[PDB]
């Protein structure tokens, strides 16, 4: 580790939601392992002047900002820093407080100015000592400055990583407006057009329209095909025939056509009246996309990168180039700033020319997947051109009523319809499979399914062990040759029972795929499940509202018991985003001494301004140390400093409107799952162990792991996998609360 | 009433909660044994007929209470205006025997039903003239009774206080401001918003009062002469007085001195030429008509949905057409012939100046909200303040109810404008004994509207045990007036302060109490601050739980809501969320009423709605606990439906202050300070220790000396309440 | 009372102690059988015997627990009787054994030892047997053929002899 030096955090340029969560982890990390941490107000504007904009930060200054959007530091237009005319004074204020390490949270041109500050660091230091203002020993002591960049722009213009800080929070504000219009346009036949915040990068226009199930998107990178004015009017006329009286047109901030002329939303309003004649009200979401409370995905990403940047500061040797920390998978990595700017220069190069195909593939791998999946899901080829393979593919929802499961059936059927298979629907899960309820569903039946929680098909946590012959009878009377299961641990156990039935029943030799769909991430072989961000955003938001009741009735600690069985995914990740003082999970052994050490920590924190307490607990963390045990222990051991209450959440965590992440998550993995089904369907021998896999997530790409090998790394006694990935964040969570 | 047939329809303007209106209209007509019929496409479906006239049942108006807009289809017809097509529309109603019409529309479509009730004798005589109907039909279906329902966010129809869709559209406006209030604090700037309402401007008055704006543009009362110079000064005053966020609420048709509307672009150019602040214009389009309907609108639509049905069978053959609307706690009916005149009067009152009377015509709610905002956003200089040399202190005692900070912001700014110095007794009575009192000013309560929980701090500690510290600390800070903003704990304290009058002389000062609790158990008051926040939160959580109950077929969720012994959150939560049963303490029940609910719930599983929402009070009974309902519903419901149980807890309170409580706390606190100033002129009687309650529509100061009888100290609830009249209205809406 | 799923201590205990009801796992009961016991108990408060004793097995019902019977009897009897609840712990298997168990442990243990000396088949399923009470004498049943008349899910046998006493007991209550 490293200590003694000072760390300087600042937020300039693009300021998105969750930025206060970033400086919360940056300040609290530099205090836990290093010396002093300093705030740099107004971004780069505070460096030029200084004096009052450079203040020391403590542990009690970044507490109540975790649930506040934007940035508490601020930012402005700084023309005296980008040019080397007054930058010498900006390099003159850091030497006063001994700040030899910088941390920029921008994502646009602010990260570029940090690299120019490091290259000129060896040039401005000799000039400040020549003018007679700094000391000779200081020009050699602080001759090396290590900086680190952090993305934080909702436009996603930094094409280095895939997901940045503010993307998930800005997407929430886009869907929240769409979900409101989805309850009004059903009165009068009309069609709305929305303008998202996508100037130089249309990543926001892609995943937001994919979530709400739009009809046509206008991207600034991939232009529409020549003749889109006549093709979109026919496409909008098709939705009028499919009983879809609501049409959504997502346009970017700078969507261009074949030439470099931007396609404004007013031009589309003048286009739907020359061939269609519908009602159209243009809507433009300005700065409302950048506002609002930060989502649970951004509160964790900003907190994770809020720790990695400080690590990438003292560990970075004085001879390494500037690195932009970004999260991608199990372990976060550092990306060089000089190489990240190179990709931005290449993106703008291909965007100026008419070679737009090389600009889309350069943006990243997730953008290419989101563009290819939506184009095959929104555009429906005519029925007379569907290459039917005379095959019946079935979809089923088995398990807990997790959110996004209604959107997983939408992506599974329409992809299979375009793939050339008639789609059957097994209602009420495995209980309905043994009971029948198999009905063909098409494109118009799953119309607008993205936006409803639970399961329209119906879900059941019933294992298909005993009721097995009844399922085989319904498998032959409907001629089902493929089955897709959308569920949690019950789907994993059911597929294992179907593996032991291939030796008995013969119709079970058909290919099968399970998609993780649970609100606990207990799915073995997968690191993410549909409905996780929905429950995570529900817990953290509700826990934040509970904190307001604590921040008032001073000296009060709230004990909250979350769900999730034994997988403390909702307890650990919920405590990292909501700022819980402690989260007791089953995988972390704890005794009476560790439980008392948290009480001692709470008694000292009550003397500060933050006289509140939030502690979480998984419902099955310990058979003896129950939820009331934490309530009974914290009360008597603090009767003269802090009282406590208890609140069992329950089923309020799951359900509701599917989260924007769970909207696109379930729509993507279910599309690739059917692609596996279609590929395995084409074989003019079906008895294998590779036909019962589970589409899981390893790091970034997807992986099809069969259930024959998942038996090793699973725990049937605790319903959770043996080794989990989020257990590496265990020390990262407890060091943010002292 | 029975035997007749009712035909509901939606035509004209739309709003949130329209599906909640037709839900109560259909279920009330079936309960009294009357045929209900859906009329699609508004008046166009009557002329066409065939498939547009369909019968409704109890399973058709379910799962739509939480869906915004209307499922019927608000259309604007054109063939019904002619009598030729109206004859075909009249004969279409005679096929199904529809002799009663219920038009839940915006404003203009309600007139078409009036012309249909006068031509009923002419059209029916023409069908028998053509021989297509039998002579008994024109005698049996001789007269047609019609009824109207306000269902538009325009609120152009006067005569009432709130219409269907007002609180829901107000929620959508405040929800956007909350996304900016927690965002624009990074850089100084000013946002300009545009709300709907061309000739009403009511949405811009209450929303700006709730969010605490700086200038409003209303079509009725125009801005003062030289407003381009007064608004720029007000925006510059807050720039240096600790306020980096200014809100400018503009109406859809806000006019000036003449009939020229003040567009939002001129305001954008006004603050960019002489002020230079970064201003972004945001025109709230049709998003105000969207979103889930609020808990106040779902109860309003459910109450008027039943009141519209009883206004049809009870309607005499010679009665005029009526439009149902809410009138305080007990709604009334208003004639359609007189409601149109008030709309034409306001228009003519707005034409050719005369704006001075257009504000008075809109009622006392508009005049009360206009006076409150004008005395709260306009701050006179400190040197022009007539200091009365009196110290007025505020205090929060009880539970951290939402919207409590919005009441203190109004209680301090009004107290300063009246000519007093304001104090802040932190931590409630616990800090009153500790001495946590500090002087606060106008700039101290900046941006307090929109922050739940409590800023001063509240404790459920009562005096008596610490009265020796309360009596000593009071005579030190020269406290001459007291204002308590809390729940039932504030009422028990004022009673103890009344008994300590002769033994302790310092407790002879006037003390006014403001209700602020989610339990709504404050005696002498009908509503309470924070009740709508928990009401909008419980029903929303029930919707997120009913979603999982609808996903997993055949599931019943036993939900236990808080509120002490008062069943306000249980009954109102059971009506706004469509619960099957709401067990409270005021309504006893045995195992027979519990088993009758299971048999009522068993027959529901045979229909398409295979779910079940049942709520229970926090302490409805010491025996029939929450697990008792969960254990009985699991054993007796074995094989027909599975059931779980969930307890809400403190999550209902301490949330984002609902726009109703953002104005409720801001309204009655300014009136509570006026009651202090009216008594701070010269103490020895009982009219000094009173509470501020809601009787019918206005407020009343009931002294705690006489409130000892109409309260139940054994259960912390009043003996007689007001929402108990909605108990039969809530039970008839669950099969 | 304890005893797992076997209502032997609840059935025989309610017969000797004179309990008005004894809810065991072997007899199903709903809310109507629970309410009939309360309606018959209300009529008992109008006589000289103004008391009430009701027994319940440790695991007679998954939902009708001990607190469920106490909560229903308290509310449905508000004003005619005030009921309480009490849970018997491990005190049932107390210290000094009953004189009947003193001879029971000595009578059948000698016959079990006589069976050991007599046999020592050799390597089958009857060398492992039990010592049960048929009618008046004892019987040595092998553990292999004792699977069709037992329920391993509740650790109790299928058909029990004392279940024929459930027709009685009631006639001695109300």
Swiss-Prot record, chain A:
Glycans are attached at residue 520. It catalyses: beta-D-fructose 6-phosphate + ATP = beta-D-fructose 1,6-bisphosphate + ADP + H(+). The keyword Kinase applies. It is an enzyme of class 2 (transferase). Beta-D-fructose 2,6-bisphosphate binds at residues 461, 518-522, 556, 563-565, 619, 645, 651-654, 719. Transmembrane segments: none annotated. Mg(2+) binds at residue 108. Substrate binds at residues 153-155, 190, 197-199, 253, 281, 287-290. Its EC number is 2.7.1.11. GO terms for biological process: canonical glycolysis; cellular response to leukemia inhibitory factor; fructose 1,6-bisphosphate metabolic process; fructose 6-phosphate metabolic process. InterPro entries: 6-Pfructokinase_euk (IPR009161), ATP_PFK (IPR022953), PFK_vert-type (IPR041914), Phosphofructokinase_CS (IPR015912), Phosphofructokinase_dom (IPR000023), PKF_sf (IPR035966). Its cofactor is Mg(2+). The modification N6-acetyllysine is found at residues 375, 466, 668. Phosphorylation at Ser-366 promotes interaction with ATG4B. GlcNAcylation decreases enzyme activity. It is found in: Cytoplasm. This is ATP-dependent 6-phosphofructokinase, platelet type. It comes from Homo sapiens. The lineage of its organism: Eukaryota, Metazoa, Chordata, Craniata, Vertebrata.
Swiss-Prot record, chain B:
Residues 379-390 are annotated as: Interdomain linker. InterPro entries: 6-Pfructokinase_euk (IPR009161), ATP_PFK (IPR022953), PFK_vert-type (IPR041914), Phosphofructokinase_CS (IPR015912), Phosphofructokinase_dom (IPR000023), PKF_sf (IPR035966). Residues 1-378 are annotated as: N-terminal catalytic PFK domain 1. Residues 391-735 are annotated as: C-terminal regulatory PFK domain 2. Substrate binds at residues 152-154, 189, 196-198, 252, 280, 286-289. It is found in: Cytoplasm. The modification Phosphotyrosine is found at residue 630. GO terms for cellular component: 6-phosphofructokinase complex; cytoplasm; cytosol; extracellular exosome; membrane; nucleus. GO terms for biological process: canonical glycolysis; cellular response to leukemia inhibitory factor; fructose 1,6-bisphosphate metabolic process; fructose 6-phosphate metabolic process. Glycans are attached at residue 519. The modification N6-acetyllysine is found at residues 374, 465, 667. Pathway: Carbohydrate degradation; glycolysis; D-glyceraldehyde 3-phosphate and glycerone phosphate from D-glucose: step 3/4. It catalyses: beta-D-fructose 6-phosphate + ATP = beta-D-fructose 1,6-bisphosphate + ADP + H(+). It comes from the Eukaryota. GO terms for molecular function: 6-phosphofructokinase activity; ATP binding; cadherin binding; fructose-6-phosphate binding; identical protein binding; metal ion binding; protein-containing complex binding. Its EC number is 2.7.1.11. Allosterically activated by ADP, AMP, or fructose 2,6-bisphosphate, and allosterically inhibited by ATP or citrate. Its cofactor is Mg(2+). ATP binds at residues 13, 76-77, 106-109. Pfam families: PFK (PF00365). Beta-D-fructose 2,6-bisphosphate binds at residues 460, 517-521, 555, 562-564, 618, 644, 650-653, 716. In human PFK exists as a system of 3 types of subunits, PFKM (muscle), PFKL (liver) and PFKP (platelet) isoenzymes. Catalyzes the phosphorylation of D-fructose 6-phosphate to fructose 1,6-bisphosphate by ATP, the first committing step of glycolysis. Belongs to the phosphofructokinase type A (PFKA) family. ATP-dependent PFK group I subfamily. Eukaryotic two domain clade 'E' sub-subfamily. This is ATP-dependent 6-phosphofructokinase, platelet type. It comes from Homo sapiens (Human). The lineage of its organism: Eukaryota, Metazoa, Chordata, Craniata, Vertebrata.
From Swiss-Prot, chain C:
The modification Phosphotyrosine is found at residue 70. It is found in: Cytoplasm. Catalyzes the phosphorylation of D-fructose 6-phosphate to fructose 1,6-bisphosphate by ATP, the first committing step of glycolysis. Keywords: Acetylation, Allosteric enzyme, ATP-binding, Cytoplasm, Glycolysis, Glycoprotein, Kinase, Magnesium, Metal-binding, Nucleotide-binding, Phosphoprotein, Transferase. Beta-D-fructose 2,6-bisphosphate binds at residues 2-4, 58, 84, 90-93, 155. Belongs to the phosphofructokinase type A (PFKA) family. ATP-dependent PFK group I subfamily. Eukaryotic two domain clade 'E' sub-subfamily. This is ATP-dependent 6-phosphofructokinase, platelet type. One of its GO terms (molecular function) is metal ion binding. GlcNAcylation decreases enzyme activity. The chain holds residues 582 to 763 of 784 of the full protein. The keyword Metal-binding applies.
């Amino acid at each position: 580790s490293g200590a003694g030096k000072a760390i300087g955090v600042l937020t300039s340029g693009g300021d998105a939601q969750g930025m206060n969560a970033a400086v919360r982890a940056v300040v609290r990390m530099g205090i836990y392992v290093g010396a002093k941490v300093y705030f740099i107000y107004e971004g780069y504007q505070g460096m030029v002047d200084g004096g009052s904009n450079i203040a020391e930060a403590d542990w009690e200054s970044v507490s109540s900002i975790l649930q506040v959007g934007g940035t508490i530091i601020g930012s402005a237009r700084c023309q005296a820093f980008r040019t080397r005319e007054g930058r010498l004074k900006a390099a003159c204020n850091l030497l006063q407080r001994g700040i030899t390490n910088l941390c920029v949270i921008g994502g646009d041109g602010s990260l570029t100015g940090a690299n120019l500050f490091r290259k000129e660091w060896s040039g401005l230091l000799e000039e400040l000592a020549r003018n007679g203002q700094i000391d000779k020993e200081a020009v050699q002591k602080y001759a090396y400055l290590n900086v680190v960049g952090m993305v934080g722009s909702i436009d996603n213009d930094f094409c280095g990583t895939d997901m940045t800080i503010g993307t998930d929070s800005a997407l929430h504000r886009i869907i929240e407006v769409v979900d409101a219009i989805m309850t009004t346009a059903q009165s009068h036949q009309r069609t709305f057009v929305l303008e998202v915040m996508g100037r130089h990068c249309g990543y926001l226009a892609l995943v937001s329209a994919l979530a709400c199930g739009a009809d046509w998107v206008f991207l600034p990178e991939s232009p529409p095909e020549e003749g889109w004015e006549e093709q979109m009017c026919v496409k909008l006329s098709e939705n009028r025939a499919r009983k879809k009286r609501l049409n959504i047109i997502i346009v970017a901030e700078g969507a261009i056509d074949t030439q470099n002329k931007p396609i404004t939303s007013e031009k589309i309003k003048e286009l739907v009246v020359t061939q269609l004649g519908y009602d159209t009200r243009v809507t433009i979401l300005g700065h409302v996309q950048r506002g609002g409370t930060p989502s649970a995905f951004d509160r964790i990403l900003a907190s994770r990168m809020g720790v990695e940047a400080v690590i990438a500061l003292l560990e970075a040797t004085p001879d390494t180039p500037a690195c932009v920390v970004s999260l991608n998978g199990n372990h976060a990595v550092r990306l060089p700033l000089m190489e990240c700017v190179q990709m931005t220069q290449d993106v703008q190069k291909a965007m100026d020319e008419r070679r737009f195909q090389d600009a889309v593939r350069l943006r990243g791998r997730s953008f290419a997947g989101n563009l290819n999946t939506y184009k095959r899901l929104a555009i429906k080829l005519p029925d007379d051109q569907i290459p039917k393979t005379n095959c019946n593919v079935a979809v089923i929802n088995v398990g807990a009523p997790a959110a996004g499961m209604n959107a997983a059936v939408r992506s599974a059927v329409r992809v299979g319809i375009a793939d050339g298979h008639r789609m059957l629907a097994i209602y009420d899960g495995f209980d309905g499979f043994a009971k029948g309820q198999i009905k063909e569903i098409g494109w118009t039946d799953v119309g607008g399914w993205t936006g409803q929680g639970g399961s329209i098909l119906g879900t059941k946590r019933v294992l298909p062990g005993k009721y097995l012959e009844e399922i085989a009878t319904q498998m032959r009377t409907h001629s089902i040759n493929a089955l897709l299961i959308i569920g949690g641990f019950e789907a994993y156990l059911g597929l294992l029972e179907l593996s032991a039935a291939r030796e008995k029943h013969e119709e079970f030799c058909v290919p099968m795929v399970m998609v993780p769909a649970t609100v606990s991430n207990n799915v073995p072989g997968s690191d993410f499940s549909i409905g996780a961000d929905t429950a995570l955003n529900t817990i953290t938001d509700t826990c934040n509202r509970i904190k307001q009741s604590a921040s008032g009735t001073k000296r009060r600690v709230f004990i909250i018991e979350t769900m999730g069985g034994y997988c403390g995914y909702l307890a650990n990740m919920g405590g990292l985003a909501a700022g819980a003082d402690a989260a007791y999970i089953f995988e972390e052994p704890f005794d009476i001494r560790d439980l008392q050490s948290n009480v001692e920590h709470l008694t000292e924190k009550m003397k500060t301004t933050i006289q509140r307490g939030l502690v979480l607990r998984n419902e099955s963390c310990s058979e003896n140390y129950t939820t009331d045990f934490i309530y009974q222990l914290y009360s008597e051991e603090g009767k003269g400093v802090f009282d406590c209450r208890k609140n069992v959440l329950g089923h309020m965590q799951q359900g509701g409107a599917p989260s924007p992440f769970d909207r696109n998550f379930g729509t993507k993995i279910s599309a690739r799952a059917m692609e596996w089904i279609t590929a395995k369907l084409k074989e003019a021998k079906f008895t294998t162990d590779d036909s019962i896999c589970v589409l899981g997530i390893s790091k970034r790409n997807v992986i099809f792991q069969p259930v024959a090998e998942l038996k090793k790394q699973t725990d049937f006694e605790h319903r959770i996998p043996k080794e989990q990935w989020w257990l590496k964040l265990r020390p990262l969570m407890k060091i943010l609360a002292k």
